[PDB]
Design a binder for this molecule. Sequence first.
Ligand SMILES: O=C(O)c1cc(O)ccc1O
Ligand SMILES: O=C(O)c1cc(O)ccc1O
Ligand SMILES: O=C(O)c1cc(O)ccc1O
Ligand SMILES: [Zn+2]
Ligand SMILES: [Zn+2]
Lengths: 337, 334, 334, 321
Amino acid sequence: MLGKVALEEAFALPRHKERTRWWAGLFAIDPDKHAAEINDITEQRIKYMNEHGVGYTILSYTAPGVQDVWDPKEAQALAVEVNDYIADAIKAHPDRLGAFATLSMHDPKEAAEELRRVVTKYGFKGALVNDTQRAGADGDDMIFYDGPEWDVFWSTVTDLDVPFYLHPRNPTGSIHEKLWAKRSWLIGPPLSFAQGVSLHALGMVTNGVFDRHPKLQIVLGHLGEHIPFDMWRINHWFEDIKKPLGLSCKLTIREYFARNLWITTSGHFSTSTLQFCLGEVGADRILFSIDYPFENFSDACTWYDGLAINDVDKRKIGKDNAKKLFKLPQFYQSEDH
Amino acid sequence: MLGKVALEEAFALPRHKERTRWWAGLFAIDPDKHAAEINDITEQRIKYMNEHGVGYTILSYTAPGVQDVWDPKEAQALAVEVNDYIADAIKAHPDRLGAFATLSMHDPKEAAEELRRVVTKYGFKGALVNDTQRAGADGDDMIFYDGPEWDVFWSTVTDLDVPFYLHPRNPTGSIHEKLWAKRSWLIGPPLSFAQGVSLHALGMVTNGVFDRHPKLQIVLGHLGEHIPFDMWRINHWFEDIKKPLGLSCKLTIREYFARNLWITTSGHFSTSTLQFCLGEVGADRILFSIDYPFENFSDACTWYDGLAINDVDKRKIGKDNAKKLFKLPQFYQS
Amino acid sequence: MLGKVALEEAFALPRHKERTRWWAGLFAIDPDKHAAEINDITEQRIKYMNEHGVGYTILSYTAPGVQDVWDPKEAQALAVEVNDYIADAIKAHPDRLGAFATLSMHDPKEAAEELRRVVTKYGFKGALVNDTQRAGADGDDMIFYDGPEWDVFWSTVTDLDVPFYLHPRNPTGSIHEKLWAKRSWLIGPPLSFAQGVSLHALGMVTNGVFDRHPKLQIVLGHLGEHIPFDMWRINHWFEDIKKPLGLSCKLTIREYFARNLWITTSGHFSTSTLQFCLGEVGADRILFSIDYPFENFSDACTWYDGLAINDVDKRKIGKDNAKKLFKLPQFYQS
Amino acid sequence: MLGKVALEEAFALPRHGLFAIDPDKHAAEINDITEQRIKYMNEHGVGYTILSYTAPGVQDVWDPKEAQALAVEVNDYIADAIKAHPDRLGAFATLSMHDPKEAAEELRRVVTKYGFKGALVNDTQRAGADGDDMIFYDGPEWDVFWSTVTDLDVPFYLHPRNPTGSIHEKLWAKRSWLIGPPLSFAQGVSLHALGMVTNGVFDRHPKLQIVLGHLGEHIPFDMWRINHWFEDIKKPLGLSCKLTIREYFARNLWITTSGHFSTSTLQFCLGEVGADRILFSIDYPFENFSDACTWYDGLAINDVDKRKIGKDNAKKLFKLP
Ligand SMILES: O=C(O)c1cc(O)ccc1O
Ligand SMILES: O=C(O)c1cc(O)ccc1O
Ligand SMILES: O=C(O)c1cc(O)ccc1O
Ligand SMILES: [Zn+2]
Ligand SMILES: [Zn+2]
């Protein structure tokens, strides 16, 4: 299928080339090719899109990104640097590339202003944030975004009417735990097995962020970070246990999934799991995505192009859902192969 | 869920009660209750709708219905009687009851005329025809509607822009004698029903009805009369072998399911089969239905109300798809 | 995965040049390659097995085969000639090739003796029959095997304790003339093949073949010839309606599928439909198969080898289930 | 279906306060072994349940002598408490997992003296001055324990445990209503179970049987991602474990239906895991019998898998009457 859209697609800053290529060696083989790909915006990356039937991708700053930076002043500047960087690097190809805002999430009103700056001036499609914001004098605390003081940020998000993509971040736990994770081949991307996004997304639900922002759109990767697998358990926990003891979120977990959540196929090229999510989530709330360059175009689009599912859902998931959700340009698919 | 729409819902003529009750002895454990309920239009029927969250039912004449009458003049008269009867019986409840045309399918242009008549004058939502039309001196020939001589009928169908519901009919005469009579517990829902419809629907597909009438909307009950089970197999054999050897229908089987066919959950309350069809067919083209009174409201609506599937699709298959397909006003229910 | 077993694999008699080229022209875009593949037993066939991870295939006579032959003597002659031919032809590779008996089904005891003769002297794994036996002087009759008069045959099958593979057949005679000739692109894999097997197999259920012969194992190809799609629907109508009204088979349809029935993946390389059958049927009763040469090895085994399913079932469906059912010895890559 | 087997069923020491809706039924039910528990087993078609000590239990006790003592206390107590009903009640060993050779000894003792069905351990063992450390069991020093486990040929049930504290993280979780069981959403079992694979526990102990609750703590949902991680990224980078994740799930792991009564998810797991490795379980008393067994009795799935998951798999795995 031609004209696909992907939106968990990462880039890094050229001035970090050496930091970046170091981390690439601890992730996958061929770190030279992956480091070059995650720095490239307009050459191989678009070549890959042409060869694999992808009309358009939305780019995001690679994790941990700004959410790893605990000094507020330094985090804000990096967000501005990154946003100005990527807006400029993609300007010539509006039919192939959009960008999500990178943000400092230290202060609710600083974050809302920077989203407004770059959405208004650059036409960014939303925000991609790598879970909680590291904070504290030496980064030992974290900032959650579901408290009442974040209402001002979510109202900016719905006012701009752009979605918010909640991407994983390497968990910051014990010394013993990180060393065990590294020695056990279980740490890092694309797996992100230790991720806290699924818990944090349930927090936004239980703390009413979607009751106060019923039009808010949050996007989850990895086909929903296993939440659809626990839909029954989560429903049971709300309706039968927690709501009876005081939990006041107005709707059911399935109603929030119908109004406020989206899942992408980032790094999850599973026909069986996708078909399972047709039941638990539905084709109308599922977005194709690759997680390039941690995943390669070929694995993602070979899989998706070959999906033996009904035509309407295959188009909705492959491109027509994102085309509307991210207000893609009409005739964007006339610039491919 | 409230406001569900069901549209494979049967009624019979009161003057036919005697034989209506006989026939039921074979398909209902309590044929007296079946005849009372299949004869009733506005009392037990809508009370069942009120207690089981069904806002709207589109009613259709019970099978075999007109397709059992092989004399053309007698068949045509029954269709007219049935159509005028039902338009009048449901007139006091336009927010709860709708009707499909009943038709004699002996003559393509007679059928088109009576379809246009009743859609225009009574506002019927489409046609419900019970598979092939019995014909011949002793009613042992069969009329399929996939031949070119039916083009004039389909053009009226697409001209009105109403769907056509392709309903099973019991097997009869020689076909009945050769295959079913010696294993007749398979007659009806068990196997014979879906064997007939799928033959007929796939005939329309492979003989180009949907190519000549691309706006035609055909609805199949019982989650598609087996066809989705073999979507992969049919597609593979159409696309990789039969089309290379002469099959000339223009689209893939999957594309017809995306633009010309609809499936309902009539008499098939199977969560796992429904979930399988979420993939093979898609939620946008599945409609709730019951098959009342062969099935009862409580089995169908208890099953449906309880589906632990995503709410968007639950809303679509339970009512929204039918509201759009048949253009129903926006009622909400008690 | 290595060591796969496939068991709906056809071969033809080399003397039947017309019949082979004719059937091949309706089922392949390259009928010349199909005729060579369906005639070869030991060269191309074993090359494909080596290249695609298939340790063992059980061979069967191509359809329609003996079930197309309405002269009882001529059909018995053909069946005996086929069984003697394939026993010699696979003799050099008993670690890679097995065979099902080909039988004339005009007489239960005649068939019973031929199955006993070839299972006992040649080591046949069971019988594969192409649906109903064409009978009558003008070949318009069809013989089903679900009546009690076949008990003497089904008891031979259970005494030998080998399965019976019920393969489709093209529709013939009046049925073919009335239903299929005018939509004849539905003949074979698209619809007609599963309509006849399902009718017949559900006949064995409803007419008590599995009640009288409870140890009998019947194998259906093509993931069950539509039947699993209707497990729920068939179950509901048997248990709630037809049984109270007289159907007397003693188990549920699910129990027959648990105790007596098997489905294969022949010609149905559909991940989604397989996933559905894992629930409705269970991996313990699902066997890999290809339908070679109508299907090619590469399509069947790229699909199977690439299935992202749990390893226990992948091994059971791919070789372990067949290794137990057909009592296979330690064969190539087993 | 009658004769069902459930094996994630918890009990507490009577000597040990209010946590759920109508909490009185929960405290009485989790202390009861032979009265409340067996009457429900009769009412809902459950022939046999294997009992286990409530989380976090011993894994929360970081003092080695105090942990060993409670474990021996708990084992000796439940073995006597269920003595009268051995055709209905079974038990998993409670263990201090501070010392592999000491844990192996206590597992051996109670399997040998009391006929326990295996071990149930609540994820990692709290350890170190003040309990700021945890013990993992996948290193070579635990081979002596796993060989004891495989020699006794009993399964090992890896149960969740209250996650690592962080003050803000604990407060945020407990104001956000996402804290505690039966959800235990921040479980570490998924990560640790996968560790046993990547650190070679199943390579060094090919016969070890590990059981996971909550239908596998989402590992089945991520089976494609984990397989792809092993075979296409980590193995080519240097990971040396000998089999694929699916092969380990086929040979060494089990999932139960504890606290996860979802027909659609179960059917999802027939594909990802398979009926031969799924065991019914309830999570009593955190879950109640009627929700668990009303769900299971009503499953419209093929007959063989229903009897395998309901009792037949547990009867063979646990070598039951
Ligand atoms: O640990 C993670 O979840 C992670 C995810 C990424 O996409 C990039 C770097 C990471 O460390
Ligand atoms: O986040 C980490 O500390 C990390 C460390 C590694 O050695 C390899 C990958 C990682 O993601
Ligand atoms: O379900 C049945 O047995 C049935 C029988 C008929 O004659 C007509 C329609 C039906 O639905
Ligand atoms: Zn990414
Ligand atoms: Zn009907």
